[PDB]
Design a protein around this ligand. Structure first.
Ligand SMILES: *[C@@H]1O[C@H](CO)[C@@H](O)[C@H](O)[C@H]1NC(C)=O
Ligand SMILES: *[C@@H]1O[C@H](CO)[C@@H](O)[C@H](O)[C@H]1NC(C)=O
Lengths: 224, 49
């Protein structure tokens, strides 16, 4: 696949807690995406997998209903730990698949252990639409979280929010990371999170409007 | 301890509490029915003779 490069452009600020705050300049220390970082612009037409290095910021600008799910796991081959997420559009199941189910992974359309059968709602949800994800492993419970957006560019100028979506309390030692396409051209972005201190700005609503990365440049250190 | 009243604050559906600067709760969500109710301690002050 084609490995292009793009800067992150102050995108990926997320809610760190389940607590309403209003008009408070609260400063948090969580695993965020650093400002102006080289995210990758994988053009999927061709395939080894991606690392999961303390959380993966996933973004995709597809509208034609191509992106489906991911195979967050460790080794994905056989007989090992193999507790791999079989994250899908609605079936977020933690089956040990041993070998690769659904043939080679392209989602064709036209024994050991039988545990952790977690089943939930539709996980995700008229010209363009951008999906933003911030999958962290964290402390035991995997946090997967999604926000919408209106305008679509190559990670455009603006600030967004999080609205956390699921809180699955299962998953052990995820290091490798995959992506499902729809084959009967994806162009998705991948960013890697690092432990940094942020300074979040709320408003009269409960809404993070701005953020300051407290170790980017000395002006931001003065502001923090 | 405190008085309770209805709230005009619009909680997001994933939020539960509301915190203050001194780490005390400002508003809480009722667990039985989904309504937001404020937290404010009862009236107090000094007494001068
Ligand atoms: C991201 O990595 C590529 C790899 O060579 C590099 O060319 C680019 O300058 C990096 N972006 C930075 C340092 O902002
Ligand atoms: C807070 O949310 C309400 C509900 O939509 C909105 O009408 C109001 O303008 C918001 N306050 C702002 C944007 O300052």
């Amino acid at each position: 696949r084609t490995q292009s490069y793009t800067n992150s452009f102050t995108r990926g600020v997320y809610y760190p807690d389940k607590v309403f705050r209003s008009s408070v300049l609260h400063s948090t220390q969580d695993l965020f995406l650093p400002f102006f970082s080289n995210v990758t612009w994988f053009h999927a037409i061709h395939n080894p997998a991606l690392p999961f290095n303390d959380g993966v910021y996933f973004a995709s600008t597809e509208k034609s209903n191509i992106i489906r799910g991911w195979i967050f796991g460790t080794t994905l081959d056989s007989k090992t730990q193999s507790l791999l997420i079989v994250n899908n559009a609605t079936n977020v199941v933690i089956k040990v698949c041993e070998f690769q189910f659904c043939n080679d992974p392209f989602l064709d359309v036209y024994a050991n252990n039988c545990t952790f059968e977690y089943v939930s709602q539709p996980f995700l949800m008229k010209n363009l639409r951008e999906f933003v994800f911030k999958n962290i492993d964290g402390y035991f419970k995997i946090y997967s979280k999604h926000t919408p957006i209106n305008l679509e560019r190559d990670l455009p100028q603006g600030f967004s929010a999080l609205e956390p979506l699921v809180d699955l309390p299962i998953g052990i030692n995820i290091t490798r990371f995959q992506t499902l396409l729809a084959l009967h051209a994806a162009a998705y972005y991948v960013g890697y999170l690092q432990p940094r201190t942020f300074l979040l700005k709320y408003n009269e609503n409960g809404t993070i409007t701005d953020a300051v990365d407290c170790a980017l440049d000395p002006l931001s250190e003065t502001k923090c | 301890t405190g008085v309770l009243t209805e709230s005009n604050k619009k909680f997001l559906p994933f939020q539960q509490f509301g915190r203050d600067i001194a780490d005390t709760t400002d508003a809480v969500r009722d667990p039985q029915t989904l309504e937001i109710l404020d937290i404010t301690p009862c009236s107090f002050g000094g007494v001068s003779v």
